[PDB]
Scaffold this active site. Structure first.
Site, PDB file in Angstrom:
ATOM      1  N   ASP A 137       1.018  -1.175  -0.287  1.00 42.42           N
ATOM      2  CA  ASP A 137       0.059  -0.449   0.126  1.00 42.42           C
ATOM      3  C   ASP A 137       1.123   0.828  -0.080  1.00 42.42           C
ATOM      4  O   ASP A 137       1.685   1.199  -0.185  1.00 42.42           O
ATOM      5  CB  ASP A 137      -0.990  -0.030   1.132  1.00 42.42           C
ATOM      6  CG  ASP A 137      -2.311   0.358   0.974  1.00 42.42           C
ATOM      7  OD1 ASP A 137      -2.491   1.211   0.053  1.00 42.42           O
ATOM      8  OD2 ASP A 137      -3.227   0.160   1.732  1.00 42.42           O
ATOM      9  N   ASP A 156      -9.847   3.603  -3.254  1.00 42.71           N
ATOM     10  CA  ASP A 156     -10.765   2.620  -2.728  1.00 42.71           C
ATOM     11  C   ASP A 156     -12.513   2.345  -3.718  1.00 42.71           C
ATOM     12  O   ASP A 156     -12.972   3.424  -3.544  1.00 42.71           O
ATOM     13  CB  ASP A 156     -10.642   2.541  -1.458  1.00 42.71           C
ATOM     14  CG  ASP A 156      -9.559   2.188  -0.948  1.00 42.71           C
ATOM     15  OD1 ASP A 156      -8.030   2.535  -1.663  1.00 42.71           O
ATOM     16  OD2 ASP A 156      -9.471   2.431   0.340  1.00 42.71           O
TER      17      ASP A 156
END
Ligand SMILES: *[C@@H]1O[C@H](CO)[C@@H](O[C@@H]2O[C@H](CO)[C@@H](O[C@@H]3O[C@H](CO[C@H]4O[C@H](CO[C@H]5O[C@H](CO)[C@@H](O)[C@H](O)[C@@H]5O)[C@@H](O)[C@H](O[C@H]5O[C@H](CO)[C@@H](O)[C@H](O)[C@@H]5O)[C@@H]4O)[C@@H](O)[C@H](O[C@H]4O[C@H](CO)[C@@H](O)[C@H](O)[C@@H]4O)[C@@H]3O)[C@H](O)[C@H]2NC(C)=O)[C@H](O)[C@H]1NC(C)=O
Ligand SMILES: *[C@@H]1O[C@H](CO)[C@@H](O[C@@H]2O[C@H](CO)[C@@H](O[C@@H]3O[C@H](CO)[C@@H](O)[C@H](O[C@H]4O[C@H](CO)[C@@H](O)[C@H](O)[C@@H]4O)[C@@H]3O)[C@H](O)[C@H]2NC(C)=O)[C@H](O)[C@H]1NC(C)=O
Ligand SMILES: *[C@@H]1O[C@H](CO)[C@@H](O[C@@H]2O[C@H](CO)[C@@H](O)[C@H](O)[C@H]2NC(C)=O)[C@H](O)[C@H]1NC(C)=O
Ligand SMILES: *[C@@H]1O[C@H](CO)[C@@H](O[C@@H]2O[C@H](CO)[C@@H](O)[C@H](O)[C@H]2NC(C)=O)[C@H](O)[C@H]1NC(C)=O
Ligand SMILES: OC[C@H]1O[C@@H](O)[C@H](O)[C@@H](O)[C@H]1O
Length: 417
Positions: free
Chosen positions: A132, A226
């Site tokens: 990430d 997201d």
């Protein structure tokens, strides 16, 4: 990037990830059940073989003796023990870290510790690393921003300019030399030295123009912020990706994020559109829902043999691409009304997808002369949803429900004169 074993990660990864299902509230049992269910529901047989731990698996308060430690209450046998249980089931285990000082949920992360983390992951039998982008320190910040509509101010048509974004990268800027590329490359390099092969999934949210260098670094890269389980996010991501398909080939796939099949307020139609386009765009396909709670209908959706074969095609690396936008002019960036007409070749034939972005039934027609790689004539056509032989057709017209996608496989030419 090509992996040493010559196959792992060449086509999009398929599996299950805890995030959309459980977010931060995970423990071993949730992975053991996911795995048991992937096996027993026939999803593994379908191709879904990664059981991927996302954020929140580690001891949150810091490294233990220089290493990220599994939260032992959550994982009483450790990652290595879970790995063994998962490997025994014929599955692969994914884990998660961050190219920053803490994960997005605030757990210990890997920036500056890549070599030690890579060794732990390898030694644990981990097979996949989702990596990430949170918590990048000031000194590791990129000089510039890339034109990413999910994060930066845009003008009409998703455009960036200097006036809107003073830090926009100047033309000709080489993103492979950016700090983002370095951060990700450092974990690529660390993993590469371990004996156990781990694929790298670059959760970078489409930042730093990862499209241009991601293939030198990992096997996939998130291309947006997201996903959420609603139509707004499905069209948002569809639209963004539709302009970035040239980065998608073998070993290197844009990641349209984890599947929301089973989640939120997506209707059956929206769900179909979501899965079909994710598959067709050759995003990795990571189930993100509790499999015990998933309807047999959504399970059958996930197992669609044609969408999976197309996604997993080992001869044609490119994804299906838009050939016609539809309501808008071709190449119109539009978050609510993305490209509607999609096609790509595969070993099984040409896949054609027609997305009804309208909230009412619309008639959509696949016309062979419009589709790259097809020509006027008659082709054998199969409905991908029903697996029905629709016959030898000169075109294909369907009434497509609101937010639904008509999906057909165009086979061999037929019935000439
Ligand atoms: C709103 O913004 C969008 C996004 O920026 C912008 O989109 C561009 O729109 C123009 C038209 O205005 C498109 O130009 C056409 O390109 C046609 C074919 O292009 C293919 O090749 C494009 C160039 O490829 C190069 O660049 C890429 C990366 O830069 C690189 O990988 C390649 O190797 C190569 O160097 C390519 O960008 C484009 O990819 C887009 O489209 C495919 C779908 O086809 C999609 O899957 C991708 O995801 C991506 O969106 C595609 O691969 C070309 O045939 C066409 O030519 C027409 O006119 C000429 C006149 O010369 C006639 O000869 C011909 O018959 C055609 O009628 C035209 O040049 C351009 O490709 C878009 N760019 C992108 C990135 O999508 C819009 O213009 C903006 N709108 C407004 C109002 O400004
Ligand atoms: C990311 O990097 C990877 C690894 O370097 C790179 O993968 C390569 O992709 C190309 C393009 O798909 C592969 O080459 C193809 O392989 C298929 C199946 O074997 C063939 O069908 C293709 O041949 C057709 O096209 C050729 C010319 O384009 C023609 O000669 C021929 O007539 C066919 O019509 C084609 O050879 C290549 O094998 C992989 N590389 C590896 C090591 O696997 C990928 O392209 C990169 N991504 C991007 C966007 O560049
Ligand atoms: C490891 O995971 C366990 C279980 O999720 C966490 O235990 C919780 O701890 C907090 C405070 O530490 C309590 O409020 C909760 O009630 C506990 N829950 C349970 C079910 O035991 C623990 O916090 C995690 N530890 C670390 C360091 O990450
Ligand atoms: C995205 O595309 C949609 C469809 O073209 C646009 O919605 C139309 O907008 C015009 C101007 O408001 C209206 O006349 C139409 O009624 C709308 N059509 C539909 C079906 O909603 C929208 O304008 C586009 N968005 C942007 C930012 O350009
Ligand atoms: O906290 C974990 C999460 O972090 C975000 O940055 C990422 O985009 C999500 O997929 C999820 O991984």
């Amino acid at each position: 990037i090509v992996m040493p074993d010559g196959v792992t990660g060449k086509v999009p990864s398929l599996g299950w990830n805890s995030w959309n299902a459980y977010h931060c509230d995970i423990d071993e049992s949730k992975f053991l059940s996911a795995a048991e269910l992937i096996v027993s529901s026939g999803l593994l047989d379908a191709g879904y073989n990664y059981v991927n731990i996302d954020d929140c698996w580690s001891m949150k308060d810091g490294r233990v003796d220089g290493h990220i430690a599994p939260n032992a209450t959550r994982f009483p046998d450790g990652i290595d023990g879970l790995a063994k249980k998962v490997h025994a089931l014929g599955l692969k285990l994914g884990i998660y870290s961050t190219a920053g000082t803490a994960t997005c949920a605030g757990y210990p992360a890997s920036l500056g510790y890549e070599d030690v983390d890579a060794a732990d992951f390898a030694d644990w039998g981990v097979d996949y690393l989702k990596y990430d982008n949170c918590n990048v320190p000031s000194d590791w910040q990129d000089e510039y921003v890339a034109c990413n509509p999910d994060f930066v101010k845009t003008g009409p048509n998703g455009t960036c300019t200097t006036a809107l974004d003073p830090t926009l990268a100047p033309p000709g800027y080489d993103w492979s030399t950016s700090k983002s590329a370095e951060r990700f490359g450092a974990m690529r390099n660390a993993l590469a030295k371990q004996s156990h092969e781990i694929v790298l999934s670059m959760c970078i949210w489409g930042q730093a123009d990862v499209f241009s260098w991601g293939n030198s670094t990992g096997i996939s890269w998130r291309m947006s912020d997201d996903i959420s389980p609603n139509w707004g996010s499905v069209t948002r991501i569809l639209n963004l990706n539709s302009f970035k398909l040239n980065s998608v080939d073998f070993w290197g796939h844009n990641d349209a994020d984890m599947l929301e099949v089973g989640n939120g307020n997506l209707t059956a139609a929206e769900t179909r559109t979501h899965f079909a386009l994710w598959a067709a765009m050759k995003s990795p396909l990571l189930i993100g829902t509790d499999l015990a709670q998933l309807s047999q209908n959504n399970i059958n959706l996930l197992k669609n043999k044609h969408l999976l074969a197309f996604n997993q095609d080992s001869v044609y690396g490119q994804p299906a691409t838009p050939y016609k936008w539809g309501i808008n002019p071709d190449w119109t960036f539009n978050v609510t009304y993305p490209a509607e007409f999609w096609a790509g070749p595969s070993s099984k034939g040409h896949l054609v997808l027609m997305v009804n972005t309208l909230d009412i039934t619309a008639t959509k027609e696949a016309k062979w002369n419009e589709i790259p790689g097809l020509s006027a004539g008659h082709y054998e056509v199969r409905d991908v949803w029903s697996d029905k032989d629709l016959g030898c057709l000169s075109s294909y017209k369907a009434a497509v429900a609101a937010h639904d996608t008509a999906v057909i496989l165009v086979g061999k030419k037929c019935q000439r004169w």
